[PDB]
């Protein structure tokens, strides 16, 4: 294997633009999960027999 | 293997722009999780048989 | 293996821009977790059989 | 292995810009965790069978 | 292994800019943890079977 | 191993800029931990089976 | 005018890759100009009533 | 005018890669100019009524 | 004008990589100019009514 | 004008890498100029009505 | 004008790497100029009506 | 004007690395100038109507 004058991207996020002008929110969470932001996960490898990689709003409850 | 004048990106986040002008929030969390920010996780490797890498708003409760 | 005049990025975050003009928040957390900031995790390796690497808003409770 | 005139970044954060003009907050935390700052974790390796590396807003309670 | 005229960064944070003009906060923490600053952790290695490296807002209570 | 005219950074923080103009805070902590400063931890190695390296806002209480 | 989290390129050259394997040249210039290299000019502004900006192989002779 | 978390490039050259393996040259210049290298000019402004900015192989002779 | 957490490049050269393996040259210049190296000029401003900024292989002869 | 946590580069050269393995040259200059090295000029300002800033291989002869 | 936690570079050269392994030269200059080294000029300002700043291989002869 | 926790570089050279392993030269200069070393000029200001600042290989002869 060899790379000459090249590039690679094995899991990336970019150019995430967010313009929020004159907003209003009123969240009233009482249990559980409310996720109203801007998230950006970027992984290369997640092994493991049960891994819950990259969760956003998870309520895993017995 | 060899790289000459090259580049690599094995898990990255960049160019995350956030313009919030004249906003208003009223969150009233009472239990659980409220995540209204700007998050950016960037990992290369997560092993392990049960790992919960990159959680955002998790409520894992018995 | 060899790298000549090259570059590598195995887990990175950059160019995180945040412009918040004329905002207002009113969070009233009473238990749990409220995360309304700007976070940036950047890891290379997380081993271990149960690791919870990169949590943001976690409530792991029995 | 050898590197000539090259660079490496195995877990880094940079160029974190935060412009907050004319804001107002009113957090009233009563138990749990409120994290409304700007955080930047950057690790290379986290071993261990249960490690909770890079937590931000954690409430791990029985 | 050898490096000639090169560079390495195994866990670093830099270029953390924070401009806060005309702000106001009113935090009223009564138990738990409120973290509204600017934090920057940068580690190379964290071993140990249970280590909680890089916590910010932790409430680990039985 | 050998390094000629090179550089290394195994856990560092730099270029932490903080401009706070015309602010006001009113923290009223009554128990727990409030951390609204600017922190910068930078370690190379943390061993030990339970180490809690780099805590900021910790309330570890039974 | 203002730019937020943006970029500009007013005259640039990049990603010039040149792979020359097992070549042979025999140039026998006797007057004039022979230019068999790799050139990359990049200017922003060239004023002047007669300017000959960015010449490569010029023989301007009376 | 103002720039926040942005970038500019008003005349630049970068990522010039040149791989020359097993070559042979025989230049026999006898007058004039032979330019078989790798050149990279990068200017911002060249004024003047007759300027010959960025010449490579010039023979300007009366 | 003002720049916050930004960058500028008004005339620059970078990332000039040159790999020359198993070459051979035989230049026999007898008058004039032979330029078979690697050059990198980088200027910001060149005034003057006749300036010959950034010449490489010039033979300006009456 | 003001710059906060920013950077500027008004004429610079960097990251000039040159790998020459198993070469051979035979230059036989007899008058004029032979320039087969690695040059890097970097100026900010060159005034003057006739300045010949940044010459490399010049033969200016009447 | 003012700069806070910032940087400037008004004419600089850096990261000039040169790896020459198993070479051989045979220069036989007989008049003129042969420049086969590694040069790095870095100026801020050159005034004067005729200045020849940053010459390398000059033969200016009547 | 004022600078707080900042830096400036108005004409500098640094990080000039030169690795020459198993070389051989045979220069036989007979008049003129042969410059096969490693030079690094770094000036801030050169006035004067005719100054020849930063010459390397000059033969200025009538
Ligand atoms: C050919 N026959 C076979 C073949 C395969 C199998 C087989 C394969 C995989 C598994 C995995 C079982 C798991 N159990 C848990 C419990 C909890 C948890 O995470 C808890 C939480 O707190 C963390 F987020 C993650 C996991 S994965 N079981 C059986 C059986 N028989
Ligand atoms: C062929 N037959 C087979 C094959 C495979 C299996 C098999 C494979 C994997 C597993 C994994 C079991 C786990 N249990 C927990 C509990 C808690 C936890 O994390 C707790 C929390 O506090 C941390 F976030 C993480 C984990 S992973 N079990 C059985 C069985 N049989
Ligand atoms: C083929 N058969 C097999 C194969 C595999 C398995 C198997 C594999 C993995 C596991 C892992 C069990 C764990 N338990 C805990 C408890 C607490 C915790 O963290 C507590 C918190 O305070 C820290 F955040 C983390 C962990 S991981 N168990 C069984 C069984 N059988
Ligand atoms: C094939 N069969 C197998 C295979 C694997 C296993 C197996 C593997 C891993 C584990 C890990 C168990 C842990 N328990 C704790 C408790 C507390 C804690 O941290 C407490 C807090 O204060 C610090 F943050 C961290 C940890 S990790 N258990 C069983 C069993 N069977
Ligand atoms: C194949 N079978 C197997 C395989 C593996 C295991 C196995 C592996 C790891 C563990 C770890 C157990 C721990 N317990 C604590 C308690 C408190 C603490 O920190 C307290 C706080 O004050 C500091 F922050 C940290 C730790 S880690 N246990 C069992 C069992 N069986
Ligand atoms: C294969 N079977 C196995 C394998 C592994 C294990 C195993 C591994 C690790 C551990 C660690 C147990 C610890 N307990 C404490 C208590 C307090 C503390 O710090 C108190 C505070 O004041 C300081 F901050 C730190 C620690 S770490 N236990 C069991 C068991 N079985
Ligand atoms: C409405 N009527 C008008 C309007 C416009 C004009 C008009 C406009 C431009 C010009 C330019 C004339 C020039 N002459 C030279 C000579 C040599 C040289 O460079 C020499 C070499 O060594 C450098 F590389 C560059 C230049 S530009 N002339 C007349 C006349 N009438
Ligand atoms: C409306 N009527 C007008 C309008 C415009 C004009 C007009 C405009 C420009 C010019 C320029 C004339 C020049 N002459 C030289 C000679 C030599 C040289 O450089 C010599 C070499 O050694 C350096 F490299 C550069 C220059 S530029 N002339 C006339 C006339 N009439
Ligand atoms: C409206 N009418 C107008 C308008 C404009 C003009 C006009 C404008 C510019 C010029 C420039 C004339 C020059 N002559 C030389 C000679 C030698 C040299 O450099 C010598 C070498 O050794 C250094 F490298 C550089 C220069 S520039 N001339 C006339 C005339 N009429
Ligand atoms: C509107 N009419 C106008 C307008 C403009 C002009 C005009 C403008 C510029 C010039 C410049 C003339 C020069 N002559 C030399 C000679 C030698 C030298 O350098 C010698 C060497 O040794 C150093 F490297 C540099 C220079 S620049 N001349 C006339 C005339 N008329
Ligand atoms: C509007 N009309 C105008 C406008 C402008 C002009 C005008 C402008 C500039 C000049 C410059 C003339 C020079 N001559 C030399 C000689 C030798 C030297 O350096 C010698 C060497 O040893 C050092 F390296 C440098 C210089 S610069 N001349 C005329 C005429 N008329
Ligand atoms: C509007 N009309 C105008 C406007 C401008 C001019 C004008 C401007 C500049 C000049 C400069 C003339 C020079 N001559 C020498 C001689 C030798 C030397 O250095 C010798 C060596 O040993 C040191 F290295 C340096 C210099 S600079 N001349 C005329 C004429 N007319």
Swiss-Prot record, chains A, B, C, D, E, F, G, H, I, J, K, L:
Phenotype for residue 10 to K: In PARK1 and DLB; significant increase in binding to negatively charged phospholipid liposomes; increases oligomerization
TM segment ranges: none
Cysteines joined through disulfide linkages: none
Region 4 X 11 AA tandem repeats of [EGS]-K-T-K-[EQ]-[GQ]-V-X(4): start-end pairs: 1-31
Expression by tissue: Highly expressed in presynaptic terminals in the central nervous system. Expressed principally in brain.
Post-translational modifications: Phosphorylated, predominantly on serine residues. Phosphorylation by CK1 appears to occur on residues distinct from the residue phosphorylated by other kinases.
Modified residues (Phosphoserine): 51
Result of altering residue 14 to Q: In PARK1; no effect on protein structure; no effect on phosphorylation of the protein; no effect on membrane- and lipid-binding; increases oligomerization; increases fibril formation; increases secretion of the protein; impairs copper-binding
Sequence repeat intervals: 6-20, 21-31
Amino acids binding Cu cation: 14
Subcellular location: Cytoplasm; Membrane; Nucleus; Synapse
Assembly and oligomerization: Soluble monomer. Homotetramer. A dynamic intracellular population of tetramers and monomers coexists normally and the tetramer plays an essential role in maintaining homeostasis. Interacts with UCHL1. Interacts with phospholipase D and histones. Interacts (via N-terminus) with synphilin-1/SNCAIP; this interaction promotes formation of SNCA inclusions in the cytoplasm. Interacts with CALM1. Interacts with STXBP1; this interaction controls SNCA self-replicating aggregation. Interacts with SNARE components VAMP2 and SNAP25; these interactions allows SNARE complex assembly and integrity.
Function according to Swiss-Prot or TrEMBL: Neuronal protein that plays several roles in synaptic activity such as regulation of synaptic vesicle trafficking and subsequent neurotransmitter release. Participates as a monomer in synaptic vesicle exocytosis by enhancing vesicle priming, fusion and dilation of exocytotic fusion pores. Mechanistically, acts by increasing local Ca(2+) release from microdomains which is essential for the enhancement of ATP-induced exocytosis.
Associated disorder: Genetic alterations of SNCA resulting in aberrant polymerization into fibrils, are associated with several neurodegenerative diseases (synucleinopathies). SNCA fibrillar aggregates represent the major non A-beta component of Alzheimer disease amyloid plaque, and a major component of Lewy body inclusions. They are also found within Lewy body (LB)-like intraneuronal inclusions, glial inclusions and axonal spheroids in neurodegeneration with brain iron accumulation type 1.
Domain-related comment: The 'non A-beta component of Alzheimer disease amyloid plaque' domain (NAC domain) is involved in fibrils formation. The middle hydrophobic region forms the core of the filaments. The C-terminus may regulate aggregation and determine the diameter of the filaments.
Protein family per UniProt: Belongs to the synuclein family.
Full protein name: Alpha-synuclein
Species for this entry: Homo sapiens
């Amino acid at each position: 294997v060899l790379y000459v004058g090249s590039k690679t991207k094995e899991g990336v996020v970019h150019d995430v633009t967010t313009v929020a002008e004159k907003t209003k929110e009123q969240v009233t969470n009482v249990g559980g999960a409310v996720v109203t932001g801007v998230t950006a996960v970027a992984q290369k490898t997640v092994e493991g027999a049960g891994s819950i990689a990259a969760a956003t709003g998870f309520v895993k409850k017995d």
